[PDB]
RNA sequence: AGUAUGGGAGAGGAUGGUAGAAUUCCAGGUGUAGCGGUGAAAUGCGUAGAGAUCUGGAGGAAUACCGAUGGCGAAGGCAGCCAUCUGGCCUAAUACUGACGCUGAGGUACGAAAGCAUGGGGAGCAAACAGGAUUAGAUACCCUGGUAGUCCAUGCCGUAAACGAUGUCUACUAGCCGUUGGGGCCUUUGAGGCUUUAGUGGCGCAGCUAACGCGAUAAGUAGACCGCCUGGGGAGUACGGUC
């Protein structure tokens, strides 16, 4: 398959759903297959310019292995949840586990 | 973006805030945006820079 | 009637005039003066003592509002941006900062053709 | 370099906000391409601002 | 598009020794399949002409391979051809 | 000449999403006589409230900085970011086929911009056109407006100073200094110094040229194949034909 890096910003008023969602999308990966390579919760942290006219948003770091189908339908779900505000997919060669910066 | 100081003159404010925008260069943007340069003079302007840029190069070696 | 203590001037100073309007926070107007409010008609109107006319004209005017520390906001590539700038501390406001506003794009629109003059 | 290294993306950026050329930094050329991959996806995931 | 699994397969199918990898049955088959499976792919976009290019490149390969092996050995190009299904 | 396997760089192509800056328009708050434009003016906009300033919304087109004598592509050409499909190139060592090559009349594919057909879209710009200036006259250059078009989908057209004004392929012939993507070696700790390869630049010995100039990216020394020229106009024209 192919390892992909999402990175996901959460309205900070829904904080408080982001485990359940980050649940649902980890186990939809696992059920296709996954390989949950990566989880990080940043946390709630300033934006350098504001988004949606909000300030502060929550961040989420995930690295995934998964394959079309998984791929689709989680991008599916991303757009469809009015809770995420933004979400970038950038795929990748290798799978990266080392804990990154900012994880603080 | 120029914050006075304290006891910070006027004319020095005005002074060190447009060099702060020389600096910045965004004056040069602006004449640009007066009118359209089409694509071929770009180029030439482009290329007649870099034969300047490199003929300076040598001097400075020299 | 109204009082206020921190007001920004705006300065729009294009090549043919310079605006000078002095507002305070969150952008409403309190008063503004234009070198064609001072005499100064057509070609003369672009010139930097005109600018300069203009700025103590609606500092003057501002001083009733009483303002007594401002901020500066510059935008245009104006002749008239020095002196606006310069009238403002000899009418006796304190400047607290000045930037320069002007907006760029970042390959937005076509501009207009070359002139053959 | 990736876009979450903020602390090295900021060094070559100036106030404005603006990339800072490689004839500036002293920066290798492919070095200077991944630097601005990695500005331009930092200023979309809003860890550094587009302008000032 | 084919995968390393695939092309193995194809060499070892068509292979007339150990470790060929250069013979004009192998090479023929390894371009018939990569045309066949670009047939999908200039189905979808009908506008891609700088991939076309390659693909014209790869069928005037096969045909000139195709005509070496026939002036070298008939027998081996008649096999190859009914093989792989091609009409000449 | 080609094939399999590892690694690498790239604005190469096609589809679909998405981000920020700016212009225009709309609505609202603050606010009041100008704004705009030029060599100078005028046409134009504004007291049913402009311009300026702040907040929100709609839409279209293009992607600042990076950016480079940089990169990729047969050429035409290709720049925000992300995903999917996809072509070529570079680089190392073995392994494999065994001349399978070069060029190419006819033929065929692609081919900037403008233009054409059907249907959408339309912010900015702007042929035609209207008005204001200038002028002996203005038919133009300047100014205020402004429709095709520029954008999208599906097709056509097949032309450019489509240029390096330099057809493709191969071998050989002093050196010096840059730069891009790789390979190897050496210091000795991490950044430098030698080479080699494929591109991209500046000088320059020999040689060549009417001269200007070219000079391992030849316009030098040779070979293979193709295209083209034969004084200037009439003329890339008429007739016939193909599209
Ligand atoms: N497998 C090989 C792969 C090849 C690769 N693909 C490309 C390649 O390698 N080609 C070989 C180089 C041939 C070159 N094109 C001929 C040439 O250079 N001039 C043409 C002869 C004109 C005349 N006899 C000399 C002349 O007037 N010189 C001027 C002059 O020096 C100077 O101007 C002025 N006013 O003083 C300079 C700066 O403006 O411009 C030059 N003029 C120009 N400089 C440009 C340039 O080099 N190119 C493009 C074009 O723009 C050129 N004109």
Redesign the pocket.
């Given at each position: 398959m192919?390892h992909?890096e999402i990175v996901l910003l959460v309205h900070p008023d829904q904080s408080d759903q982001v485990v359940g969602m980050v649940e649902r999308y980890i186990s939809q990966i696992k059920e296709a297959d996954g390989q949950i390579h990566r989880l990080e919760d940043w946390g709630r942290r300033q934006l350098a310019?504001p988004?949606?006219?909000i300030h502060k948003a929550h961040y989420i770091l995930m690295n995934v292995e998964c394959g079309?189908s998984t791929?689709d339908e989680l991008?599916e779900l991303f757009?469809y949840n009015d809770a995420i505000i933004?979400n970038?997919?950038?795929?990748?060669?290798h799978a990266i586990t080392e804990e990154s910066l900012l994880a603080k | 973006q120029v914050k006075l100081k304290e006891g910070e003159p006027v004319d020095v404010a005005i002074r060190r805030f447009k060099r702060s925008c020389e600096k910045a260069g965004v004056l040069a943007?602006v004449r640009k945006r007066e009118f359209?340069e089409k694509?071929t003079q770009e180029r030439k302007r482009?290329?007649a820079?870099?034969?300047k840029?490199?003929?300076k190069?040598?001097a400075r070696?020299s | 009637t109204?009082t206020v203590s921190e007001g920004?001037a705006?300065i729009?100073a294009?090549?043919?005039?310079t605006?000078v309007?002095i507002?305070?926070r969150?952008?409403?107007?309190?008063?503004?003066a234009?070198?064609?409010?001072?005499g100064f008609?057509?070609?003369?109107?672009?010139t930097p003592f005109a600018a300069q006319v203009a700025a103590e004209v609606a500092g003057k005017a501002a001083l009733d509002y009483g303002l007594k520390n401002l901020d500066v906001?510059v935008?245009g590539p104006g002749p008239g941006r020095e002196s606006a700038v310069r009238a403002l501390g000899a009418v006796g406001y304190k400047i607290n900062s000045i930037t320069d506003?002007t907006?760029?794009?970042?390959?937005?629109?076509?501009?207009?053709?070359?002139?053959?003059? | 370099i990736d876009y979450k290294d903020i602390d090295t993306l900021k060094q070559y950026i100036?106030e404005?906000?603006?990339?800072?050329?490689?004839?500036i930094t002293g920066?290798?050329?492919?070095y200077?391409?991944?630097?601005?991959?990695a500005?331009?996806?930092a200023?979309?995931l809003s860890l550094i601002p587009?302008?000032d | 598009?084919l995968t390393?699994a695939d092309?193995?397969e194809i060499?070892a199918k068509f292979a007339?020794?150990?470790?060929?990898?250069?013979?004009?049955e192998?090479?023929v088959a390894?371009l018939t399949a990569?045309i066949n499976?670009?047939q999908?792919?200039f189905k979808?976009?009908?506008?891609?002409?700088?991939?076309?290019?390659?693909?014209?490149?790869?069928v005037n390969?096969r045909r000139?391979?195709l005509?070496?092996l026939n002036?070298?050995d008939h027998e081996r190009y008649t096999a190859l051809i009914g093989a792989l299904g091609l009409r000449r």
């Open positions: 192919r992909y310019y988004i949606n006219k079309q791929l991008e757009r933004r970038l997919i950038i795929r990748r060669e | 943007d359209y694509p482009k290329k820079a870099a034969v840029r490199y003929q190069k040598l070696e | 109204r920004v705006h729009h294009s090549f043919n005039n605006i309007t507002t305070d969150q952008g409403n107007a309190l008063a503004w234009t070198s064609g409010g001072q008609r057509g070609s003369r109107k672009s906001l935008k506003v907006p760029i794009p970042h390959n937005g629109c076509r501009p207009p053709k070359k002139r053959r003059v | 100036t404005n906000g603006k990339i800072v050329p490689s004839r920066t290798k050329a492919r200077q391409r991944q630097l601005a991959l500005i331009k996806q200023r979309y587009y302008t | 598009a390393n092309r193995a060499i007339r020794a150990e470790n060929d990898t250069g013979s004009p192998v090479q390894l990569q499976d670009l999908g792919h979808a976009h009908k506008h891609d002409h700088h991939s076309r290019r390659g693909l014209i490149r790869m390969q000139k391979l005509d070496y002036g070298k």
